[PDB]
Design a protein around this ligand. Structure first.
Ligand code: 3PE
Ligand code: LMT
Ligand code: C8E
Ligand code: CA
Length: 451
């Protein structure tokens, strides 16, 4: 025979796997008594979840009962999250002076042993106005304005709403969704991933189609000035696959690698592709239940076939170097108390970038025949540069009540890879209530475009 604690723990897992997680959570309440977590059966969810808070004096039985109960309870809870993200990057009026707002609403709920989500993103992107000459025209390296001075669409901005649905458990994940409807170029996007542990190392394989959100042109597309061609172009999407490996030795060390490759395609944009390699090593200087401090070394190497970072018609307005090398030293401090959880991090880096000389107008059939001779003699000069940069990030979340959580995050991107910075605020509602350990780190919503 087995001990009462073991019988109840086993029975709870059996009930959950059989499709009765509600009964399983009741059995975990009994398991807490039989295991010695408490002397009296919890009769409210706040008492129950408070008893799942980790305790470093726990032996393995008590530690597992708490963690198993907490994992099932979190998996079964209905959450609703509302988030606003203000993001962007400095640049040139009319196409890259980017100030953007994303508002996100997400509902998460159990399904089988995983969680389903339902998401809407509302995106507004403002890229400012073209600078004009006395005539009121401009000749920026954008659209076809270097082939004939442009007029008519001086102020540039767009807005749209996307939706997404998906599901994930510990083994696999999928999502399907859209890019914002209301933009010039609208697509179906999504992904699928599978994870397993072939011994000591973990791996994840995935396939995805995602937008490039770093500029309006790349994300939603723009229209050439009505004085010129008026053609829509942009809306670049990455269709590709990736493999990640992790040989986490447990304990204080860990290493990981990732190799991925994508086709990069858009509306009236020259075809492109990229392959990207990343590795990392990390060391846990402090590794406690409520405080984790890490320092690491990260490397990245990228290659894009073509430099389509220009904003002329036929290019895509996205960073696409032919050589990219980065070496970084990330540091991170994560900590939680009874009702707060935060992360503070930074990462100094050195990087090298090189781009080849490209035709400014790589798709000649978008160009009027009486402009094609002049277009063919226009090129974007290649270049290269190296330097130091950094990123920094702060995340803060607090429990207001059992049902209400609020958080902020700031993501400072100054590492010379043209990524935008982000500032966000969110509120998360727990239907059942949660008085267990805070999430470490906090988990804000990620804009769907950046999955
Ligand atoms: C026990 C340990 C305790 C640790 C506790 C940690 C808590 C620390 C608490 C304080 C936090 C301090 C934060 C310090 C990190 C922040 C870095 C930073 O912000 O500096 C930015 C700086 C860029 O500034 P800039 O003026 O442009 O140039 C400087 C020239 N040096 O950029 C830099 O700083 C330069 C960074 C250098 C990056 C070099 C990357 C080398 C990586 C090695 C790769 C080797 C792998 C071999 C690969 C083989 C081939 C694939
Ligand atoms: C297994 C690889 C090992 C890892 C290496 C990772 C480094 C990846 C960065 C590669 C940089 C790509 O750089 C690329 O080099 C080739 C030449 O070699 C150039 O190619 C250019 O020169 C060659 C030689 O005259 C011409 O045949 C070609 O028509 C021309 O386009 C590309 O214009 C450039 O974009
Ligand atoms: C820490 C406090 C958490 C606050 C909850 C955040 C909820 C997010 O609400 C989103 C609503 O914000 C709309 C702001 O509108 C921005 C203006 O839009 C740009 C138009 O140019
Ligand atoms: Ca529109």
């Amino acid at each position: 025979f087995q001990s009462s604690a073991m019988v109840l723990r086993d029975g709870a897992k059996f009930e959950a796997q059989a499709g009765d997680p509600t009964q399983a959570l009741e059995t975990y309440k009994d398991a807490m008594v039989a295991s010695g977590v408490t002397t009296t059966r919890p009769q409210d969810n706040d008492t129950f979840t408070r008893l799942t808070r980790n305790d470093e004096k726990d032996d393995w039985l008590k530690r597992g009962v708490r963690s198993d109960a907490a994992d099932l309870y979190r998996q079964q809870d209905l959450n609703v999250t509302l988030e606003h993200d203000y993001w962007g990057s400095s640049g040139t009026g009319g196409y890259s002076d980017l100030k953007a707002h994303t508002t996100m609403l997400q509902v998460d709920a159990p399904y089988s042993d995983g969680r389903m989500f339902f998401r809407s993103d509302f995106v507004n992107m403002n890229v400012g106005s073209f600078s004009t000459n006395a005539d009121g025209k401009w000749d920026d390296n954008w659209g076809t304005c270097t082939l004939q001075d442009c007029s008519g669409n001086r102020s540039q901005s767009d807005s749209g709403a996307s939706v997404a649905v998906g599901w994930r458990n510990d083994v696999w994940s999928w999502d399907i969704g859209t890019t914002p409807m209301g933009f010039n170029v609208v697509d179906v996007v999504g992904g699928i991933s599978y994870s397993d542990d072939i011994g000591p190392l973990g791996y994840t394989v995935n396939a995805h189609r995602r937008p490039i959100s770093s500029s309006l042109l790349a994300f939603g597309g723009q229209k050439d000035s009505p004085s010129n061609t008026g053609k829509k172009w942009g809306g670049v999407r990455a269709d590709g696959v990736g493999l990640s490996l992790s040989y986490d030795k447990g304990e204080a060390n860990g290493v990981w690698a990732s190799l991925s490759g994508d086709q990069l395609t858009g509306k009236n944009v020259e075809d492109n592709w990229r392959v990207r390699w990343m590795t990392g090593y990390y060391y846990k200087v402090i590794n406690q239940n409520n405080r984790r401090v890490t320092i690491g070394l990260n490397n990245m190497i990228w290659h894009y076939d073509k430099d389509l970072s220009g904003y002329s018609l036929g290019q895509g307005g996205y960073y696409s170097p032919q050589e990219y090398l980065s070496f970084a030293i990330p540091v991170m401090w994560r900590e939680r108390t009874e009702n707060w959880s935060w992360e503070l991090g930074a990462s100094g880096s050195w990087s090298h970038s090189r781009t080849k000389t490209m035709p400014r107008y790589p798709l000649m059939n978008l160009i009027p025949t009486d402009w094609q001779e002049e277009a063919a003699r226009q090129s974007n000069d290649g270049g290269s540069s190296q330097g130091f940069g950094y990123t920094a990030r702060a995340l803060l979340e607090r429990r207001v009540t059992s049902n209400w959580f609020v958080g902020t995050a700031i993501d400072i991107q100054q590492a010379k890879d043209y990524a935008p910075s982000h500032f966000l605020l969110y509120v998360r509602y727990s239907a059942a209530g949660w008085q267990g350990d805070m999430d470490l780190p906090p988990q804000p919503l990620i804009p769907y475009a950046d999955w």
